Each structure stands twice: as structure tokens, then as C-alpha cells.
A paper describes a structure:
Type I fungal FAS forms a barrel-shaped complex composed of two reaction chambers.
We used cryoEM to reconstruct ab initio ACP densities inside the reaction chambers of endogenous fungal FASs from S. cerevisiae and the opportunistic pathogen Candida albicans in the Apo and KS-stalled state, at 12 Å resolution, allowing localization of densities corresponding to this mobile domain. In the Apo state, ACP density is strongest in proximity of the KS domain in S. cerevisiae FAS and allows for a complete tracing of its backbone atoms in the high resolution cryoEM map. Examining the surface electrostatics of ACP- KS- and ER-domains shows a strong surface charge complementarity between the structural lobe of ACP with the KS domain in S. cerevisiae. In S. cerevisiae FAS, second strongest ACP density is observed at lower resolution and less stringent threshold of the AAI map that shows ACP near the apical region of the reaction chamber and facing the AT catalytic site. In both FASs in the Apo state, the structural lobe of ACP has stronger and better resolved densities compared to the canonical lobe in the KS-binding site, as observed in the high-resolution refined maps, suggesting a more stable interaction between the former and the KS-domain in the absence of substrates.
Residue numbers in the entry:
A (entry chain G): 719 to 798
B (entry chain G): 1277 to 2050
C (entry chain G): 161 to 559
D (entry chain A): 1 to 94
The structure:
């Protein structure tokens, strides 16, 4: 989509089955952990990450990429 | 050149070095990554490398002055190696002593041929043999020092009449150790060798034909009886064989497969030169590296060494036909046809055709770039490490094998010889049993034969170990000198009766096996065993311990003795039986000792008989037998504890290993009477874990039957013979079901069997074992 | 770039003798000639090189070229890899008028994969265009003797087709002394090999040879043993087209690919230890010896990732011990800091820099291809031209 | 040793083995193991009318000898005279 419409923003409210309501199987991290790059090659993507947040402490890493560290990955901070 | 063409040639001891083979191989193309590994190890060498050491002797035979010819137009016509059976391949540390002798030198019109044979030995043991066939083409008339010698196709003579044994005894070369012998219904084999000195291409001048004459036994284990010794002069042929061609037949150990099957059509490349080989083999023939001879030879040029081609193709094969193991190859020959030149590529075909002595028979054919043939031959290559198992009772069914009994002469020759013998001894053919399982079989004791047979039935005894008494006890009690008949009953059908299952199973199996043997699918190093019944079929098949007839006599005696030791109801139903068990189902934790803790308890508590009699597969299969009123109760407790999944393992490990005793006593003394109120005609079931065994109602292979062996053991000592037996086919290859260890003649084997059976022969032997010291 | 990245490395020389002939002929001549000289001066190498090593005439007419099983082998190939790398170095140093010394001066450091390492340290001593062929010799000799003293320490042996064919339908190819595993860690395979070895003896035992990534690993051993491992993996496969989309994460089967590399001998194993000593002689038999003072830039140990100037004694010793006996922690060595990377190594498109990027993606580092002139749409890395661009187009920066 | 005294001794051993083959349970576990592991067979043939040992095979092999059989490139093959007639006669057509 983005590649097809480069200038229109696009928000990915990525989220894992661990979120209420409808409930995927995939884990929250791994597909992010392995597609963040493929994403950032398109600046029209505003990234957002849910599925299990209720505070600042619970998400700040996701804001500063720290999470990807423990998985031996470059920090991958999220846009929202 | 005063070599005696008739004498032997002595080579010289040659030690092997990992360097020389590493040189050879690369001089060849034998990249089989098996012949070489880390140095400093005993690495194994190639069959072909034998040439390397036989050469310096193989050809001292063709130099002699009596054998005149020009080494230039000389030709290598063929070459073969035969790794003699039982001898391993060869290694680096293996020093060798070679020997060579010319078998035959014939004088064709087109020149003169020689066929030489070399034999190699390590430590005095022969290791392999080698045949070679050259040709001093041209023209020669020196028949005086010409001769020939060969082995013949072992002939088979099947004797049915009596006017033939006379024409035989009419003979002068058909002499024996004792003319007394009986030569009717006997089968003879003639492994004769012929020698001959010529004076013309056809008109002989001296003829020897010698060789043993052997006889079939009821085991068909041939044995020597007499000797042929035919002597003659001025012959024009060989009679000793002509009287066998039409009279007898050709026991062609070979057999062609039904539908040929190609393996591959590969390609290789000659070297660019021929010097490396020439250095390795010691074959310094200029004909392959120098050009100022090949032109002296009216040749194309510096051709390859044909033997290089032999080795190239043999290694081309080993990888493909033997998946790159060499020890398998035990025979390989090749026939050179025409010659080739370096830097040449080939279409070498491969094709599985025949079988011999349980090993495969391949042919090859090397086509050129013009797709013309140069090499052709064959290879005797072992089969994988092979194993034959034989079933037990429970697999029977109708038509079993009779589909085959119409097909393989080798199997009908068995079923007949068996039934015909029964009919003549006990009065029933199974070929009217298997085809139509009847419910009842009545036996008539008619005239003389009838009496013969009714006593055959009453001449047997259920000896039984009580008081130490070899209790002379009657097998058939309704029988008597005043009787005239008898009846066997089996509500489903007598094939459901161990009385008659055992023998038919043994038949079917033995028959299949001897069909195979007719097809040469059985090695000598193969293994064999059976499951509680196939042991006898296996013994016969592999080792031919005994005939078909004594075999089946005793299997019948056995089926009965199994039958007798339990009292039965109206038709033959009793209160004992057996059951199969899968620990895995009751619990994935259900160990082998779980079966113990669950069976010993029922046994002690109900005082009834239940005992694991076959260790089939661990944690997955164990079969027990004994009192049904206790066996199905053990079934009940298992079907209860699985729906409870009380892991007797978690009992041993959660409880001290003795409070478990009272806990299981409670469980089981409850479940028994919960389950012991069954009626007399007890029915068996698969609940959760255990499975019944119907057709079976006797708990054999448990101590309850220890008493019925001396009867047996004695019958055995009667039927079989220490002569027919041959350890050669037992050591390592037989694995008893009693002793799961391979049959071996040792104190430790004897004590392994004894300490668990506790019988006098073992102990008296190990006491007198020193007879071993002759 | 080391060994085990492509199938036709020799064709990668075509261009250099076809394209850059004017610029690399003298060098390749020097190399091939010193090589034949080694073949002769040495005692027995004349055997292993069955079809010889006259390479120059393998160029003008590929017909004169042997095939892989004689051309893909180590004692015939490894030096050719080294020289390919050296040529991809010289062409640039020239196109910039940079003498080797001048060029080296520009870098923070260097390093190499399984074998390329030597080439790297080679550079570290180059100063001129005439003090060059000396180092060329110093390295090409090392590769020659390595490939040789190995090929006999563990040669190739034809494999029973009973495997060859099954491995094909099994999604694999011709076995080889080393196998690559994807999507899987270093502990799982360690367990698997502990098992597979428990059944087997040392002389057939295997071991992890290369920690390429953190999930892209490589092990070494007898093709037989490696195929056995392959099957005790087939036990655990999960064909990528299985669509486990409808089963939770933890309840899924580990799917991953794996295959043999076009290699001819098991580097970084115990099998080849016996040859190590043998070569430390063949070198001092010659005059080859590397020194810290002579290297101006640091190079790092594929094993420790530490510098070599800093080292107890001889260097070439630690070098070889890292090529044959020890594995490579491509990350422990790549712990350095930079902005740009470029592999003269073979493969290029499939070369080492690719997977390095695959590890060095979110770290703010840019890799290129100094061996091929081609295009990557995503421009996640670059190629040769991206080196010479004097414009801002050349100084491209992934994030 | 002396072939003949040994012939006799073997005749005996065999005799009593077959005799007490009546009550002593069958150590099929140990056999199924030894001849499968100490001799590394490639072909086991269930001569019989119904394939059961085959069922008893590839059920102890897989269950206990999978790591082992893969460790060493084993094409362990199990056949029955009931069904595997061409895998045993070597008479298959394409």
C-alpha cells in the first residue's frame, strides 16, 4: 500500500493476540522484531504497538527500542 | 626359461603400505572415500591391488621356453578376482604371500591361450584367488606341451528307478567306498574336475576326470560317498560328463532374476598417459606409454592399461552397487574385448541380473565414444547385513502358502514330503487342512496301516517332571489296542489348534525359505531366529539341523504336550490363557517393573497363575499367561488404574517402596474379586491396555510347564542327530529365544542358560568342560 | 570473504582477466607463476593437482578449465579466492590513485571470514605498488599450503548415492563437509549435536564451525555424519508451506531451512588439527612471517574478535588455528564501530556483506559490494559504483 | 577346537535350549536389540504368513533406535514375505 501511495500516511496499530477483543495467535514481538526494517524503508508508516499496556513503565522501552536489546537486536523504538 | 609350465610359481612376500595404495588409487580413480582415512590406522585396500603383488609371479608361467610366443602380439583377454568366502578384505599391515599356477594352456588355430590362477594368503590362510586369461595370438603346433584343465558344472542326478543304478555300477569310474549303499530316491551331485593333455585341437592324448560324488540327505546337506577316477587316451570327448548331461542335470547355483533392472549408465575418462599405473602395478609395458612399440605392434598408439580399466569400472561400481562399501564385493570378473586410448570417455552400463549363494550378480558393459563395447563382465557383490526372523503361533490362516505351493517346486517338494509322511505315519495331510479349516478330524485305524498308525498315536508318552519321575504318562488315553479310530475337535477349526498350527506354520516358513534358497537369496553370514515357534523352522532352513520329517514329528509332539498339561472342558476349552500388554497405554511412565509390581501381586494373592512370558518390546509389549480367572483380573486392574492413571511409578516414587506393597495389595485383592466372579467359560477382552489371545488357551513359556521338558528333551535327543548339525551356521547367527545372546559354545553361555534354568548338563559340562582339552 | 558463499567462484575471475586485464594481468601472472613454483619446489603437491594448476590458460578458453570437484577443492580454490579479493582491492586502490599504503591508511581496520582473514592482514603491510607482490606471495603461499596440508589431512571421498538422491527430494543437494542452518539458535543445534555425537565417535564427530549470525549457523563434519544430523532434523521439520496461522505461537513446530555449501573440506573442526603444525613449518621453510609493527591497521580474530598486533608470539599460527580448528563468532569480531562496510570477498550478491547487513541493519551501518556492479532496488546496501561516486549519491546512509 | 567334540557339545546345547524353550519367557527385547544394534542389520525379513514382527519392528527401532539409526546413515528396511515380495525378490517393474 505505502509503496503504492508514498505520501499518504498510514498507521499500523500492530498488536498481538494478548489483546482483548478479537485475539490473534501471533506473538507481539517476533514479526515486529523481523519486519521493523522492511517498514522503516517507507516513511509514510506511523507505527503503534498495543496489546498489554496500562502505564508508562510498561511501554517506555517500546518507545526507546530497549525491548529489542534483550532479544539481541538493535533498539527499535515505536512511533506510538 | 626352464620354468616348468606344470609346476607352481612362488611369488615373494609383499607387505602393504598406506603410501602405495594412496598412490594406486589416484593412479586409478578409486575415490571411494573408504579405502583411506587418517594415516596411522589400519586402512583397507582394494581387491584389485592384489594384481600389484601377483604380477611378479603370475607371469613367470608364460616366460618358459616350452611356452613359446611373442610377447608383442600378446593380449590380455580377461581377468577376475574371487575373494574366497570367510576371508576378510586386506589392509596395510597385512603382509601377503602369493602363489601362481597355470591352469590351462591351449593351442587354438588363431594362436595360443593361457589361463593362470593365483592364490594369495596372509598368515598362511588363503585370502583370495585370481584368474587371468591371455593370448599369444598367431599359430602354434606344439601340442606336446599343450594341455588343459577345468572344473565342470556340478551335475545333478536324480534316481528313481533301479536300472539306472546298474548302468552306473556297470561303470569303472563310478566307484564308491561301499557299493552296499542304497541308491533309490537319492539325489547325487558330481563336483568333478577334468585334466587333459592334447595332441591335436580335438584329438586328446590323455584324459583325467576325478572328483567326489555326493548325496542328498533328508536335510539335503550333501555328503561324500565315492570318487570318480576316469583315465583315458586318444579320446575325442569326455564321457564322464556326457553320461550326466542327458542322464543328470546342471546344478546351476546361478539364477537369473525375473525382470532385469538397470542400476546406472555412467561415464569415466581414461588418463592422458599410462605411466603412473605402470609405476604402481610394476607393469612397465611400453605398449601403454612408449610409442615405438605400439607401432611395432600394429596398434593405434599408447593405449591404456586394460587393468586400469578394470579397476576404474570396479570402483565406478562399488560406490553405486555397494553404496561405497568394499567388503561387500567378493567376486568380480571382466572380459577385455578391444583396446582403447587415453583421454577417452565411456558409457559403462550396469545391470542387476542374477543371484548366487545369497549375493547379487551384476553385469557391466563399457561403451566407447563411438558407443562400441570394450569391457564386459560381472560382479559378485554381497547383500547388506541381512536378517531373517520367523513368526510364532497366531499368524496362521487359510490358503497360507498354498498360493505358492502351486508355484515353487522347491516348496511343494516340502509340503508333499511332509504330508505324505504324516498320512503314512499319523494319517492326515495338511494340504486338506489349510485349504479348508474343518471343525473336526476323525482318524480311521483300518488294516495294517491303521494299526501301525494307531500305535504311532499310542506309542507316545507325556513324561512329566513329578517327584523327579520321568512320568511315563499316556498322550492319548481314549486310544487303545481295541480302538479303531479317534477324533480331534476344534469348534472354530483345527487350524485354531496348537496341535496343528505349529507344523503348518513351520511348513509355510521353511517352504518360503527354500524357495528363496532356490533363488540364491540366503547368505552364509546371515542371521536367523524365530518367535517361540520359528526357531525350529529357522534351525532347519539355515543350518539344516534335521529333516522335514523329524522336525515336524517333534513340532507335533510339542503342540500336544502343550495341550495336555491343562485339563479341558467338553470340546477342549480350559481355564488358562494368555494376554498381551502395552505399558505405554496404561501410562507413558509404565515401566518394565510396573508390569512386575502389578502381576506378582495378583499371582501371590489369588494364588492363580499369571506370568509375563514374552518380553516383546519394552514399555510397549509384554505378554503373560496363566489362570484366566487371574489374567483377566490383572486386565481389570489395569483398565481401572488407567481410567485412574495411578502411575505405580508415581507410587514407587511418591510412596516408600514397601507401603506400595499394602496399597497394591488392597487395590488388587479388591479388583480380583470385583473381577473373579466371572463364570467358568471366561471371556477375554481389550479394555484399556491388554489384548486377548484367542486360538490360544495354554500358558506356555512359564514355569508351570517346566515339568513337560524331559519328555521333550528326550524325544529331541531321539529325533535329531549330532551329525546333521553343523556349528558353522550357528555361532553368532543363531540367537535363541531363551538366551537372547547369539549361540556360542562357551562356559559363560552355558552358565547364562543354566543359572536361569538350573539343569544338570550345563553344570556337569563346565565341571567336565576340560574335555575341550583333547 | 572466505569460503562457502557460491558455487562458481572461478567465473568471478573472468571479469578481472576479461574486464581489468590491462590492470591485473601482471599481478595474476606473478601469482600463477609463484604458484606453479610452489607446486614444483614442494615435494608431492604434483599429485593432488591432478589436472595441474596452469590457470592462465584456463582463462582464455574455459574449455581448459577443469570442473568443480577438481576446481572447487581447497588447494586449487582457496588461493584463487585470496587473489580475487586482492584484485578487487587493487582495482580500487588504483582507480583512486591510492597506493595500498595510502588506502590502508584510510580504514579503521579490517578482518576476514574463514580464510580471507590472511588477505586482510596482507593488506596491513602493503605500502607501495612494488612492495605489494611480496605480500601477495606471503598470502597466496599460505592459502596454497593450507589447502594442501588439509586436502590430505581430510580429502574428499565419493558419497554413496543412497544419500545423494534422497537428499534431493529431501529439499537438499549434494552433501559436503559443512552445513548451514537457518532460523535456529546455537543452543538447540548444540543439543542436537551432543545427541548425534553420543551415538558416534570422535573421528566422525561434528561441531559448530561458524556462528555466522545468531540464527544462521554452520557446522562441519563428515558428509555422512552431517546427513545423519540432517535426518534427525527432518524429524523436527515443519514445511514452511504448512500455514500454522491457526495454532498459537508456543504450540508451533520450528520451521527452518538448511543446506550444504559448495565446500570441499571441513574448516574449523578437529579433523584438520594434524595439519596445523605441518604448515607452520612449510611457512618457515619459506620466509613468510607476519609482524605487528608491519601492520598499521588492526585486524580482529574471527574467534576472539581481538586485535592481532597485540599477541603473544607468531601470528600466522593463531591465524590458521582460527581457520581450521576454531570457529568464528562473526559478531564477537564485528563488535567494532563503523558506518560503512565493503566486502571484496567472493559471492557479492550472496557474499558475506549481505548477511553482515542482515545482522547490521538497525545499528546504523551501510554495506556495499566491491566485487560486482549491479543494483539493489531497496538500496539497503550498495555496490562498486557507490564507492567511486564523488557526488552525494555515493555517500548514501542507511539509518 | 576339536571339531567333533564341539559338534557333540553343540548338539547338546541346542537340545537343552530347545527343551527349556518351553517355560522360560522369550527374551525378544534383548534379541530385537542385539541383532539390530550389535550387528547393524539393514534387512530384517519377517518370514511368515502375517507381518507381526515387522509391527514389532519399526516400533522398537523408531522407539529406541532413531537417534542411533540417523547418526550413521541407516536405510534399515523391514519386509514381510506376505507383502514385500518384490522388495525381496528384487523383481519390481517401474
Amino acid at each position: 500500500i505505502a509503496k503504492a501511495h508514498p505520501n499518504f500516511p498510514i498507521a499500523l496499530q500492530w498488536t498481538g493476540g494478548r489483546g482483548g477483543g478479537h485475539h490473534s495467535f501471533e506473538d507481539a514481538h517476533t514479526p515486529m522484531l523481523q519486519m521493523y526494517s522492511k517498514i522503516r524503508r517507507h516513511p509514510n508508516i506511523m507505527l503503534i504497538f498495543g496489546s498489554g499496556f496500562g502505564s508508562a513503565d510498561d511501554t517506555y522501552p517500546y518507545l526507546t527500542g530497549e525491548w529489542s536489546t534483550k532479544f539481541d537486536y538493535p533498539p527499535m523504538p515505536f512511533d506510538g | 626359461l626352464d620354468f616348468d609350465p606344470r609346476d607352481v610359481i612362488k611369488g615373494k612376500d609383499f607387505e602393504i603400505t598406506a603410501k602405495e595404495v594412496y598412490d594406486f588409487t589416484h593412479a586409478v580413480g578409486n575415490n571411494c572415500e573408504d579405502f583411506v582415512s587418517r594415516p596411522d590406522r589400519t586402512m583397507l585396500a582394494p581387491m584389485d591391488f592384489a594384481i600389484v603383488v601377483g604380477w611378479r609371479a603370475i607371469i613367470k608361467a608364460i616366460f618358459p621356453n616350452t611356452v613359446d610366443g611373442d610377447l608383442l602380439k600378446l593380449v590380455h583377454l580377461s581377468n577376475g578376482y574371487k575373494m574366497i568366502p570367510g576371508a576378510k578384505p586386506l589392509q596395510v599391515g597385512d603382509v601377503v604371500s602369493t602363489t601362481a599356477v597355470i591352469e590351462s594352456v591351449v593351442n587354438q588355430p588363431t594362436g595360443k591361450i593361457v589361463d593362470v590362477v593365483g592364490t594369495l594368503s596372509r598368515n598362511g590362510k588363503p585370502v583370495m584367488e585370481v584368474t587371468s586369461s591371455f593370448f599369444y595370438r598367431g599359430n602354434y603346433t606344439d601340442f606336446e606341451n599343450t594341455f588343459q584343465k577345468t572344473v565342470e558344472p556340478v551335475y545333478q542326478m536324480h534316481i528313481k528307478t533301479s536300472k539306472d543304478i546298474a548302468v552306473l555300477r556297470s561303470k569303472e569310474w563310478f566307484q564308491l567306498d561301499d557299493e552296499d549303499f542304497d541308491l533309490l530316491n537319492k539325489t547325487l551331485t558330481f563336483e568333478t574336475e577334468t585334466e587333459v593333455t592334447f595332441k591335436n585341437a580335438n584329438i586328446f592324448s590323455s584324459v583325467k576326470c576325478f572328483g567326489p560324488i555326493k548325496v542328498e540327505l533328508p536335510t539335503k546337506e550333501t555328503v561324500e560317498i565315492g570318487i570318480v577316477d576316469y583315465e583315458a587316451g586318444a579320446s575325442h570327448g569326455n564321457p564322464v560328463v556326457d553320461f550326466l548331461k542327458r542322464n543328470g542335470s546342471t546344478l546351476e547355483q546361478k539364477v537369473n532374476l525375473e525382470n532385469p533392472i538397470p542400476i546406472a549408465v555412467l561415464d569415466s575418462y581414461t588418463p592422458s598417459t599410462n605411466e603412473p599405473y605402470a609405476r604402481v602395478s610394476g607393469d612397465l609395458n611400453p605398449i601403454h606409454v612408449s610409442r615405438h612399440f605400439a607401432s611395432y605392434a600394429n596398434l593405434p598408439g599408447t593405449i591404456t592399461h586394460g587393468m586400469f580399466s578394470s579397476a576404474s569400472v570396479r570402483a565406478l561400481i562399488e560406490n553405486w552397487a555397494a553404496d561405497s562399501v568394499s567388503s561387500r564385493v567378493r567376486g568380480y570378473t571382466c572380459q577385455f574385448v578391444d583396446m582403447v586410448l587415453p583421454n577417452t570417455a565411456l558409457k559403462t552400463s550396469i545391470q542387476h541380473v542374477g543371484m548366487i549363494n545369497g549375493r547379487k550378480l551384476i553385469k557391466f558393459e563399457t561403451r566407447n565414444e563411438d558407443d562400441v563395447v570394450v569391457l564386459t563382465g560381472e560382479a559378485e557383490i554381497e547383500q547388506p547385513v541381512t536378517t531373517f526372523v520367523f513368526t510364532g503361533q497366531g499368524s496362521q490362516e487359510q490358503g497360507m502358502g498354498m498360493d505358492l505351493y502351486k508355484t515353487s517346486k522347491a516348496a511343494q517338494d516340502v509340503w508333499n514330503r511332509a504330508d505324505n509322511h504324516f498320512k503314512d505315519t499319523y494319517g492326515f495331510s495338511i494340504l486338506d487342512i489349510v485349504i479348508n479349516n474343518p471343525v473336526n478330524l476323525t482318524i480311521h485305524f483300518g488294516g495294517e496301516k491303521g494299526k501301525r498308525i494307531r500305535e504311532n498315536y499310542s506309542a507316545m508318552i507325556f513324561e512329566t517332571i513329578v517327584d523327579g519321575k520321568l512320568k511315563t504318562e499316556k498322550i492319548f488315553k481314549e486310544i487303545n489296542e481295541h480302538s479303531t479310530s479317534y477324533t480331534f475337535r476344534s469348534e472354530k477349526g483345527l487350524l485354531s489348534a496348537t496341535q496343528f498350527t505349529q507344523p503348518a506354520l513351520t511348513l509355510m516358513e521353511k517352504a518360503a525359505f527354500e524357495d528363496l534358497k532356490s533363488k540364491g537369496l540366503i547368505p552364509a553370514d546371515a542371521t536367523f531366529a524365530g518367535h517361540s515357534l520359528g526357531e525350529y523352522a529357522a534351525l532347519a532352513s539355515l543350518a539344516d539341523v534335521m529333516s522335514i520329517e523329524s522336525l515336524v514329528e517333534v513340532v507335533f509332539y510339542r503342540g500336544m504336550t502343550m495341550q495336555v498339561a491343562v485339563p479341558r472342558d467338553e470340546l477342549g476349552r480350559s481355564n488358562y490363557g494368555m494376554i498381551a500388554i502395552n505399558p505405554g497405554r496404561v501410562a507413558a511412565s509404565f515401566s518394565q517393573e510396573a508390569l512386575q509390581y502389578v502381576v506378582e501381586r495378583v499371582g501371590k494373592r489369588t494364588g492363580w497363575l499369571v506370568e509375563i512370558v514374552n518380553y516383546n518390546v519394552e514399555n510397549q509389549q509384554y505378554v503373560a499367561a496363566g489362570d484366566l480367572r487371574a489374567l483377566d483380573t490383572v486386565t481389570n486392574v489395569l483398565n481401572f488404574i488407567k481410567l485412574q492413571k495411578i502411575d505405580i511409578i508415581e507410587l514407587q516414587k511418591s510412596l516408600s517402596l514397601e507401603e506400595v506393597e499394602g496399597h497394591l495389595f488392597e487395590i488388587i485383592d479388591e479388583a480380583s474379586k470385583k473381577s473373579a466372579v466371572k463364570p467358568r467359560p471366561l471371556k477375554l477382552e481389550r479394555g484399556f491396555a491388554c489384548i486377548p489371545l484367542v486360538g490360544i488357551s495354554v500358558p506356555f513359556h512359564s514355569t508351570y510347564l517346566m515339568n513337560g521338558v524331559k519328555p521333550f528333551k528326550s524325544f529331541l535327543k531321539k529325533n535329531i542327530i549330532k551329525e546333521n548339525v553343523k556349528v558353522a551356521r550357528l555361532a553368532g547367527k543363531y540367537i535363541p529365544n531363551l538366551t537372547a545372546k547369539p549361540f556360542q559354545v562357551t562356559k559363560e553361555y552355558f552358565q547364562d542358560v543354566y543359572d536361569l534354568t538350573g539343569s544338570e548338563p550345563i553344570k556337569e559340562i563346565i565341571d567336565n568342560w576340560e574335555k575341550y582339552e583333547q | 570473504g572466505g569460503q562457502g558463499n557460491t558455487d562458481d567462484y572461478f567465473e568471478e575471475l573472468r571479469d578481472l582477466y576479461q574486464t581489468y586485464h590491462v590492470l591485473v594481468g601482471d599481478l595474476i601472472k606473478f601469482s600463477a607463476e609463484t604458484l606453479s613454483e610452489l607446486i614444483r619446489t614442494t615435494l608431492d603437491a604434483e599429485k593432488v593437482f591432478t589436472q595441474g594448476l596452469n590457470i592462465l590458460e584456463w582463462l582464455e578458453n574455459p574449455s581448459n578449465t577443469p570442473d568443480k570437484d577438481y576446481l572447487l577443492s581447497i588447494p586449487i580454490s582457496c588461493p584463487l579466492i585470496g587473489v580475487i579479493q586482492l584484485a578487487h582491492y587493487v582495482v580500487t586502490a588504483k582507480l583512486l590513485g591510492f597506493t595500498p599504503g595510502e588506502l590502508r591508511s584510510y580504514l579503521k581496520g579490517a578482518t576476514g571470514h574463514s580464510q580471507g582473514l590472511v588477505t586482510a592482514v596482507a593488506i596491513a603491510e602493503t605500502d607501495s605498488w612494488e612492495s605489494f607482490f611480496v605480500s601477495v606471495r606471503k598470502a597466496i603461499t599460505v592459502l596454497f599450503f593450507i589447502g594442501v596440508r588439509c586436502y590430505e589431512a581430510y580429502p574428499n571421498t565419493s558419497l554413496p548415492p543412497s544419500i545423494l538422491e534422497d537428499s534431493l527430494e529431501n529439499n537438499e543437494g549434494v552433501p559436503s563437509p559443512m552445513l548451514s542452518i537457518s532460523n535456529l539458535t546455537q543452543e538447540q543445534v548444540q543439543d542436537y549435536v551432543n545427541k548425534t555425537n553420543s551415538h558416534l565417535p570422535a573421528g566422525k564427530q561434528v561441531e559448530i564451525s561458524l556462528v555466522n549470525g545468531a540464527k544462521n549457523l554452520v557446522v562441519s563434519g563428515p558428509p555422512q555424519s552431517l546427513y545423519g544430523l540432517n535426518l534427525t532434523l527432518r524429524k523436527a521439520k515443519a514445511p514452511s508451506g504448512l500455514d500454522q496461522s491457526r495454532i498459537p505461537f508456543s504450540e508451533r513446530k520450528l520451521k527452518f531451512s538448511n543446506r550444504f555449501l559448495p565446500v570441499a573440506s571441513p574448516f574449523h573442526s578437529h579433523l584438520l588439527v594434524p595439519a596445523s603444525d605441518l604448515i607452520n613449518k612449510d611457512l618457515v621453510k619459506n620466509n613468510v612471517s607476519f609482524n605487528a609493527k608491519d601492520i598499521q591497521i588492526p585486524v580482529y580474530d574471527t574467534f576472539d574478535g581481538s586485535d592481532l598486533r597485540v599477541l603473544s608470539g607468531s601470528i600466522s599460527e593463531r591465524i590458521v588455528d582460527c581457520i581450521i580448528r576454531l570457529p568464528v563468532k562473526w559478531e564477537t569480531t564485528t563488535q567494532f564501530k563503523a558506518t560503512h562496510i565493503l566486502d571484496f570477498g567472493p559471492g557479492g550478491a550472496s557474499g558475506l556483506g549481505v548477511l553482515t547487513h542482515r545482522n547490521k541493519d538497525g545499528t546504523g551501518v551501510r554495506v556495499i559490494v566491491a566485487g560486482t556492479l549491479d543494483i539493489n532496488p531497496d538500496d539497503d546496501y550498495g555496490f562498486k559504483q557507490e564507492i567511486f561516486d564523488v557526488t552525494s549519491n555515493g555517500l548514501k546512509k542507511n539509518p | 577346537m576339536k571339531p567333533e567334540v564341539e559338534q557333540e557339545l553343540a548338539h547338546i546345547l541346542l537340545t537343552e535350549l530347545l527343551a527349556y524353550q518351553f517355560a522360560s519367557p522369550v527374551r525378544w527385547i534383548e534379541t530385537q536389540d542385539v541383532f539390530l544394534k550389535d550387528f547393524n542389520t539393514e534387512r530384517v525379513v519377517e518370514i511368515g504368513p502375517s507381518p507381526t514382527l515387522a509391527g514389532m519392528a519399526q516400533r522398537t527401532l523408531k522407539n529406541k533406535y532413531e537417534s542411533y539409526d540417523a547418526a550413521l546413515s541407516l536405510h534399515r528396511e523391514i519386509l514381510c514375505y506376505s507383502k514385500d515380495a518384490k522388495e525381496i525378490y528384487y523383481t519390481p517393474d517401474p
